């Protein structure tokens, strides 16, 4: 099916004190493969996948240079954005940058993206056309005009619809055993009495990949939204994910309720009921 390569950069200025803390993380779907920390002893691009450990020593040194250049540019960017927003020098600020390409079931390019942020909120984005920019405010408009004059939108489209897809197709072949997997969830129901006239019904789903899963509670096939608690898809730490949906039911009415589990790895969605 579809696939996605992604990069996440986080440049935080230490107010007390040092070089701006820089974390670079690389993913292929919901799987990490590269790592770069500024406070690390290595000072190199580090592998976090078995199919990337088989890459030449010339590769690991090129990645280190590009990521080091990206960090030092972000180091001065923090010092330029403090002027655009007329903020103090004794403040900690964050520059979160994300970009990536998409590959369809066929193999060819589908979506190209770049989203940049400052202090939680959005800053500048690269559109679906990959030729125009989207500034969040009047301060970010200066960055848009600077990137339009330098014709930086062409360097982005070159790296997104080419090379990114050329290396993502290479990554999907080098790791055709690790990434092409669709682990279906291992579901189960638990029942805990909360009151002398009401009880909680928890529906589990463990060991699934990819993280995208739908846990839906129903009462007579009718989607139960009220009296429902849902937790965010959590990592297992072994390359799989976990999720649960709980529902508060009147005691004796356990049988009326039903939990539906939808996932890529399952051929037909599950239906769990209490006995």
């Amino acid at each position: 099916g579809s696939h996605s390569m992604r990069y996440f950069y986080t440049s935080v200025s230490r107010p007390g004190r040092g070089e701006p803390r820089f974390i670079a993380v690389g993913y292929v779907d919901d799987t990490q493969f590269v790592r770069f920390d500024s406070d690390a002893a290595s000072q190199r691009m580090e592998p976090r996948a078995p199919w990337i450990e088989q890459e030449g020593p010339e590769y690991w040194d090129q990645e280190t240079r590009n990521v080091k250049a990206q960090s030092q540019t972000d180091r001065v960017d923090l010092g330029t954005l403090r002027g655009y927003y007329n903020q103090s020098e004794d403040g900690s600020h964050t520059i979160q940058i994300m970009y990536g390409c998409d590959v369809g079931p066929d193999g060819r390019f589908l979506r190209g993206y770049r989203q940049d942020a400052y202090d939680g909120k959005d800053y500048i984005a690269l559109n679906e056309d990959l030729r125009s920019w989207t500034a969040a405010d009047m301060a970010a408009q200066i960055t848009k005009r600077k990137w339009e004059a330098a014709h930086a939108a062409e360097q982005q489209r070159a790296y997104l619809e080419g090379r990114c897809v050329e290396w993502l197709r290479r990554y999907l072949e080098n790791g055709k055993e690790t990434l092409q997997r669709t682990d279906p969830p291992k579901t189960h129901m638990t029942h805990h009495p909360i009151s002398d006239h009401e009880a909680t019904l928890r529906c589990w789903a463990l060991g699934f990949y990819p993280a995208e899963i739908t846990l839906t509670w129903q009462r007579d096939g009718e989607d139960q939204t009220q009296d429902t608690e849902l937790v965010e898809t959590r990592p297992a730490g072994d390359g799989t994910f976990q999720k649960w949906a709980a529902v508060v039911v009147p005691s004796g009415e356990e049988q009326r309720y039903t939990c539906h589990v939808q996932h890529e790895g399952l051929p037909k969605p599950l239906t769990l009921r209490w006995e």
Binding site: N66, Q70, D77, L81, T143, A150, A152, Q155, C164
Partner: peptide, 9 residues
Amino acid sequence: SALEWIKNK
């Protein structure tokens, strides 16, 4: 492969 052409803002 990371972005090789980094632009100053």
